[PDB]
Structure 1
Amino acid sequence: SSSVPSQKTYQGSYGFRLGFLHSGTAKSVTCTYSPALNKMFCQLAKTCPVQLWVDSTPPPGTRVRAMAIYKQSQHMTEVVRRCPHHERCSDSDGLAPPQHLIRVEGNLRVEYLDDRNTFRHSVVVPYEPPEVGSDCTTIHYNYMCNSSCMGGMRSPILTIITLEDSSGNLLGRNSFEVRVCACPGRDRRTEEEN
């Protein structure tokens, strides 16, 4: 079945929002977020911290899902996946399917889904409330193809983050645009000038 995943931001009843590190745009930066563009700029396979902020702690058994989609165009119905150079290369972590663009690092409770109905790829982790004295929870995502690998790239790629309960009920949704590139700090600077 076709699908056009919702992009609609929805804090819901726990006040679910995203946060990113304020990393600036030095040469050395591997991952930087633009508030102005609502856009991440990261390197392939590198760490991208994404914070989850909540006004009320959701119940035990809550889960966090990420899915990439093409934001717009004739590509809206196209499942985002890795290119052949990257799909068929030597880089499995033993947990991620080789086609999945998005991975989570450093979590042995990560789970990967090819949807049996829509064929969309997604990655889920358990929601862990922040440690006492911490304000948010952080997930380290890794993006496993560059923006240049993507065939719809008539279209930006959007990461959609959803909070869901143990039964799959949606509690919250947020999203940001994502560029996988050689020089995140330079491309952000450049894109904001534009």
Structure 2
Amino acid sequence: HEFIPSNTDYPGPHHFEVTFQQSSTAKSATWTYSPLLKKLYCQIAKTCPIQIKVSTPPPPGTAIRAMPVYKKAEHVTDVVKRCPNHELGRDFNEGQSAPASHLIRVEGNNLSQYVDDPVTGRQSVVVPYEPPQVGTEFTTILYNFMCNSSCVGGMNRRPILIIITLEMRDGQVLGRRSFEGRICACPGRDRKADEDHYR
């Protein structure tokens, strides 16, 4: 289907807000988020956490879906999926139940449920809203990406962007944040290059 995913930032009546724990002057860790460019840099397959704040508590049945999209209008249609090589590839595959096919996995929550919607094809990952445990904390999820942005036959260097959706108990959406991302072996030397290069 020539269906294209919705990507506007929905605050949420609950002012659903997505943010990144801040890096205190770090160079080349596993990941890094640049507010400077509103795109994060997570080295492939490595874990990566994204924090979640809100305004008012979300009804029961509430979950959130991390979904990937190619940013440039060319391949916006073309769905984001794992490159032939990796998908197939014995490592980070064997033993691991999470579909070999997808790009976004949720190492951490076992209940975290994937999806491969037949209607569109746009596969993804979900888990229901866990309130922060100790009080006015922020629910955080562990994500990890199974293919660099460079992966050929895969994303294929095409700049992708992520759409995290706070959703109903059914499928409806009450708020969603997005941002670009890029899988680099050395995220950082890349962000550093990015900023410095332009402004």
- Give the TM bin, normalised by the shorter chain: over 0.9
- 1:30-109 equivalences in 2 (<5 Å): 30-90=30-90, 91-92=92-93, 94-109=96-111
Q: What residue identity is the alignment partner of 2:123?
A: H
Q: Sequence identity, in percent?
A: 57
- 1:1-194 equivalences in 2 (<5 Å): 1-23=1-23, 26-90=26-90, 91-92=92-93, 94-151=96-153, 153=156, 155-193=158-196, 194=198
Distance 1:155 1:142 in 2: 19
In the TM superposition, residue 167 of structure 1 has moved relative to its aligned partner by 1.1
In the TM superposition, residue 99 of structure 1 has moved relative to its aligned partner by 1.1
Contact 1:112 1:123 in 2 (8 A): yes
**Secondary structure of the corresponding residue to residue 50 of structure 2:** strand
The number of aligned residues is: 194
For the structure 1 residues 177 and 64, does the alpha-carbon distance in structure 2 shift closer, same or farther, using more than 3 Å as the test? Answer: same
Distance 1:36 1:116 in 2: 37
Contact 1:64 1:162 in 2 (8 A): yes
Q: What residue identity is the alignment partner of 1:133?
A: G
**Secondary structure of the corresponding residue to residue 86 of structure 2:** helix
In the TM superposition, residue 26 of structure 1 has moved relative to its aligned partner by 3.4
Q: What residue identity is the alignment partner of 1:94?
A: Q
Give 4+ residue runs of structure 1 displaced > 6 Å after superposition. none
Note the residue ranges of structure 1 that are not aligned, 5 or more in a row. Answer: none
In the TM superposition, residue 150 of structure 1 has moved relative to its aligned partner by 4.9
What is the TM-score with the length of structure 2 in the denominator? 0.91
> What is the Cα-based RMSD across aligned positions, in Å?
1.6
For the structure 1 residues 134 and 183, does the alpha-carbon distance in structure 2 shift closer, same or farther, using more than 3 Å as the test? Answer: farther
In the TM superposition, residue 2 of structure 1 has moved relative to its aligned partner by 2.1
**Secondary structure of the corresponding residue to residue 127 of structure 2:** strand
In the TM superposition, residue 6 of structure 1 has moved relative to its aligned partner by 1.2
In the TM superposition, residue 165 of structure 1 has moved relative to its aligned partner by 1.3
